[PDB]
């Protein structure tokens, strides 16, 4: 169900992304509200695009984890934490990660173009 | 910065596409303006879609260069001209290039379907 996994562990909750994705889209202020919802959806889709993840719910990149952002092990993060707690713990780093993701995709696109250029 | 590379050469400008793309989304008349901006964004996304380029900013295709559109050499185009000059240079050929890209992607998708059919 929609947000049913909100209190579940991050690992289990990763299997419910489909429901929230479908639930992001579902008088002047009603039209304004619909336009704002569309703008937020498109900003998120463009942000995934710049990361090379436009077609996936889960995508891996080449950006390493700093470990200063969070020094918890994968077992603690995925089994003993909720997504709300995780979001709070890295609230000060999210835009840095976003910048690194954009730079990584730019390097991947240029490297891919150069590899394709070879005969 | 936004359009900061506008006066730079095409090669240098190709490295700043991310900032310009991210800033494209950023009583009744302003709501109409927001809807129009969204429609133009989606038109561009759909044009990339039908060409098979929806997932990236730099998308190489299988359409060869005609050389009648512009007979400048590769070095001249990328190292001397700016993107405004390039847009003027081929302003009369855009409707042909887009059609060829559409046909090329259609043939590519049909070929992929035929290749997947092989046991």
């Amino acid at each position, epitope marked *: 169900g929609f947000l049913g996994a909100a209190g579940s562990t991050m690992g289990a909750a990763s299997m419910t992304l489909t429901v929230q994705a479908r639930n992001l889209l579902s008088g002047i202020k009603q039209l304004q509200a619909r336009v704002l919802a569309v703008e937020h959806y498109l900003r998120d889709q463009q942000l995934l695009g710049i990361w090379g993840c436009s077609g996936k719910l889960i995508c891996c990149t080449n950006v390493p984890w700093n470990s200063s952002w969070s020094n918890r092990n994968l077992s603690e993060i995925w089994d003993n934490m909720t997504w709300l707690q995780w979001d709070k713990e890295i609230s000060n780093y999210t835009q840095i990660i976003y910048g690194l993701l954009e730079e990584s995709q730019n*390097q991947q696109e*240029k*490297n891919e*173009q*150069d*590899l*394709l*250029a*070879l*005969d | 910065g936004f359009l900061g590379a506008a006066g730079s050469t095409m*090669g240098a400008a*190709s490295m700043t596409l991310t900032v310009q793309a991210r800033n494209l989304l950023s009583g009744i008349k302003q709501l109409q303006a927001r809807v129009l901006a969204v429609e133009h964004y989606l038109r561009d996304q759909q044009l990339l879609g039908i060409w098979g380029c929806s997932g990236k900013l730099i998308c190489c295709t299988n359409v060869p260069w005609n050389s009648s559109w512009s007979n400048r*050499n*590769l*070095s001249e185009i*990328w*190292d001397n001209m700016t993107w405004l000059q390039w847009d003027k240079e081929i302003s009369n050929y855009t409707q042909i290039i887009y059609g060829l890209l559409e046909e090329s992607q259609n043939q590519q998708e049909k070929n992929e379907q035929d290749l997947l059919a092989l046991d």
Partner: antibody
Amino acid sequence: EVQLVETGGGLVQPGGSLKLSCRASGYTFSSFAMSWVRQAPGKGLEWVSLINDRGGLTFYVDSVKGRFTISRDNSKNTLSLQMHSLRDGDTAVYYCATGGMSSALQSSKYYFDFWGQGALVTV
Amino acid sequence: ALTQPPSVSGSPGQSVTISCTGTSSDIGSYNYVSWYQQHPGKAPKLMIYDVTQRPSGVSDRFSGSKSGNTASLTISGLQADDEADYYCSAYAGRQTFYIFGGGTRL
């Protein structure tokens, strides 16, 4: 116009590691791809490795891929080749050269043009 | 590898052809066959690149040729300073980038 100077080791025991570093004048490293090509002591030239203008991509012959790494630092205008395992079939004069590829915004080169004086590596 | 004659015998007033033969797939597909002149004791100098192109600093007496799965360097007006080991090299694609032959002493 362009000068390539290589600094590195000489006779080294088998099983160790060496780093051969090429410095150059006359061009910016970030604008050109560069390679390492070696002269067999008694025969001709063999290409060893090629690195892209930006340094993002590295290529090797299969006979060296497991022993040689090509690396670039544009800020220091330094190209380097790190070699490991040091099989005694690696004795050669190693030359630093420019070219070998492009980034598709310049006409493809697919040849080497400027050459250094090389360094003799023995094992 | 590419084949190449171990040596040729030039003389004043004559033209000499230095041949090179490789795999027909790599040579025919990739028309990037260059020639270098390696003076004894010195690094190789690029003399010819592409089938018919020449770099700055090399006079017109040096000219490349390609046919079938073979290529050659033709030199006329041989000078005393031209007596060096010539090498051919060709692009082999993405799995192997370059194929080299041996040296030909003038």
